Design a protein around this ligand. Structure first.
Ligand code: HEM
Length: 291
């Protein structure tokens, strides 16, 4: 099945910058969430999980149809906690009812990365809502208790190579694991609502111990109070991933550029853009607008 991007009727860059701005202003205002972490991290994770159901073999799942709005997908155990990002976006969708669901979930992620001082992420419109029977089954999102071979094979289904995988994993600088939500507990670092290359620095420089948490699962812990999942730690156990981790720990601009490309790609798998579609949009931050 081919999914052709279709621009919301009559809309252009200024319309989508208004949606960006409303997301960004609510991110600033609603600052108490998650012990003052704020909604940035969970909006990034929402964009990823709504895109990461894609299967390159038959073009099922992906960001195009906005299927998270249907109960089979919002109740996926893998999506526990993402309802907080959906509730955040509800008043945004009410103000701007013309935007598609897939366009709003993906734009939330772009807006969060940029407002937290991350790279610019070019973004294209045109996702179209598809019906309930197009919702992908549970079980397409990854397990955290696995090794590097698992991670590498997993991401081939999303058409991601080693560099793209290691870059995308740098989003684990953000937010935290929550025991009741998945079975892991703790932040990955100190700057968890500012977008930086801290994930790579901590992997290489902290003194990690393999411990069991209070849900009886193994995770890596440091005396600073940080953690890594087994799949995070696999990036320094595998020698191919390790080289790339060292590259990003030593070059913040390279990490920003490679993250931007991989994250746009993730958000666009499965979508066919007509030859005469608009060029990708680059939104201005609130700070850049003086707002
Ligand atoms: C092998 C792949 C991955 C695995 C197994 C994995 C697993 C996890 C787990 C278990 C959590 C904690 C959920 C919770 O308890 O709240 C989490 C959080 C998060 N993940 Fe991933 N993840 C992976 C890839 C990614 C990618 C590719 C991105 C985005 C580019 C991403 C972004 C996030 C963010 C931003 C959080 C924090 C959410 C919050 O604070 O509410 N993850 N991940």
């Amino acid at each position: 099945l081919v999914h052709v991007a279709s621009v919301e009727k009559g809309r252009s860059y200024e319309d989508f910058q208004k949606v960006y701005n409303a997301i960004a202003l609510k991110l600033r205002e609603d600052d108490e969430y998650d012990n003052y972490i704020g909604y940035g991290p969970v909006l990034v994770r929402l964009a990823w999980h709504t895109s990461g159901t894609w299967d390159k073999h038959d073009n099922t799942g992906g960001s195009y149809g906005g299927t998270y709005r249907f109960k089979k997908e919002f109740n996926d155990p893998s999506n526990a906690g993402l309802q907080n990002g959906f509730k955040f976006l509800e008043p945004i969708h009410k103000e701007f009812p013309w935007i598609s669901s897939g366009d709003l979930f993906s734009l939330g992620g772009v807006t969060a990365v940029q407002e937290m001082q991350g790279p610019k992420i070019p973004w294209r419109c045109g996702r179209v809502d598809t019906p309930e029977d197009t919702t992908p089954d549970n079980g397409r999102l990854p397990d955290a208790d696995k090794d590097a071979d698992y991670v590498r094979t997993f991401f081939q289904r999303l058409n991601m190579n080693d560099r793209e995988v290691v870059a995308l994993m740098g989003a684990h600088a953000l937010g935290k694991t929550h025991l009741k939500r998945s079975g892991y507990e703790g932040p990955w670092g100190a700057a968890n609502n500012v977008f930086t290359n801290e994930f790579y620095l901590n992997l290489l420089n902290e003194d990690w111990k393999l411990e069991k948490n209070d849900a009886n699962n193994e995770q890596w812990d440091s005396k600073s109070g940080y953690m890594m999942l087994p799949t995070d730690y696999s990036l320094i156990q595998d020698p191919k991933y390790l080289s790339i981790v060292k590259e990003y720990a030593n070059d913040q601009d390279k990490f920003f550029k490679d993250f931007s490309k991989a994250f746009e790609k993730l958000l666009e798998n499965g979508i066919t853009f007509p030859k005469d579609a608009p060029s990708p949009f680059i939104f201005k931050t609130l700070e850049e607008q003086g707002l």
